[PDB]
């Protein structure tokens, strides 16, 4: 592999590296919209969340913090934004 064009990598090779060590670094996180079942309030909870996020009015539990990426509590409506 003497001639890997290491300034224009494929996005397949770019995806499956670390979030450091890339040609230009970028995070694996995102922000996600969560419809809790029973309200208008879309919450804008972070993907790798760390706190127990609660809803404003329908104040049941929304997500659970775990190892890397937050286990959502209820099977609830959901979309990745931006």
């Amino acid at each position: 592999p003497l001639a890997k064009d290491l300034l224009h990598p494929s996005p397949e090779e770019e995806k499956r590296k670390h979030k450091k060590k890339r040609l230009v670094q970028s995070p694996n996180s995102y922000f996600m919209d969560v419809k809790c079942p029973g309200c208008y309030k879309i919450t804008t909870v972070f993907s790798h969340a760390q706190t127990v996020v609660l809803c404003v009015g329908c104040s049941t539990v929304l997500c659970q913090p775990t190892g890397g990426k937050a286990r959502l509590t209820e099977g609830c409506s959901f979309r990745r934004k931006q």
């Binding site: 804008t44 996020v53 931006q82």
Partner: protein, 150 residues
């Protein structure tokens, strides 16, 4: 690598390229400042201000929204703490090891770690006394350290 352990861990946050606020955060610099002004008065510290408005408000970084740091808008009208936050937690952690080490004299593992914790205080205490955060006559005394923690 890791200072007082033989670790070479590569695990730290990785900010994106685009510094601008995304097109969905309809939340101005005025509102995120006054939210921080509220919940810093609820016993919080700037390392745990930005974690909850990342997780429950979508603010990826305050310095991309207000153009300012969280400890810096706290100090901007005086309601930042006296000790720095990273100095506070090492002094609190040193008190807990030293209270452990009284009842357990034969715990030589805790005796070894206590001089490594106490060194990281004084290596970081000498930093803030040259950046004029701390008074020059500030000294870490273990006998009065239990009053620096609440």
């Amino acid at each position: 690598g890791r200072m007082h352990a033989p670790g070479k861990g590569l695990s730290q946050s990785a900010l994106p390229y685009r510094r601008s606020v995304p097109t969905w955060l309809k939340l101005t610099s005025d509102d995120v400042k006054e939210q921080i002004y509220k919940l810093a008065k609820k016993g919080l510290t700037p390392s745990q201000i930005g974690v909850i408005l990342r997780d429950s408000h979508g603010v990826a970084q305050v310095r991309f929204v207000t153009g300012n740091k969280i400890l810096r808008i706290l100090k901007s009208k005086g309601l930042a703490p006296d000790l720095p936050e990273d100095l506070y937690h090492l002094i609190k952690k040193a008190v807990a090891v030293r209270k452990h080490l009284e009842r357990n004299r034969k715990d030589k593992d805790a005796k070894f770690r206590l001089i490594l914790i106490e060194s990281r205080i004084h290596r970081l205490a000498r930093y803030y006394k040259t950046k004029r955060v701390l008074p020059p006559n500030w000294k870490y005394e273990s006998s009065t350290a239990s009053a620096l923690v609440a």
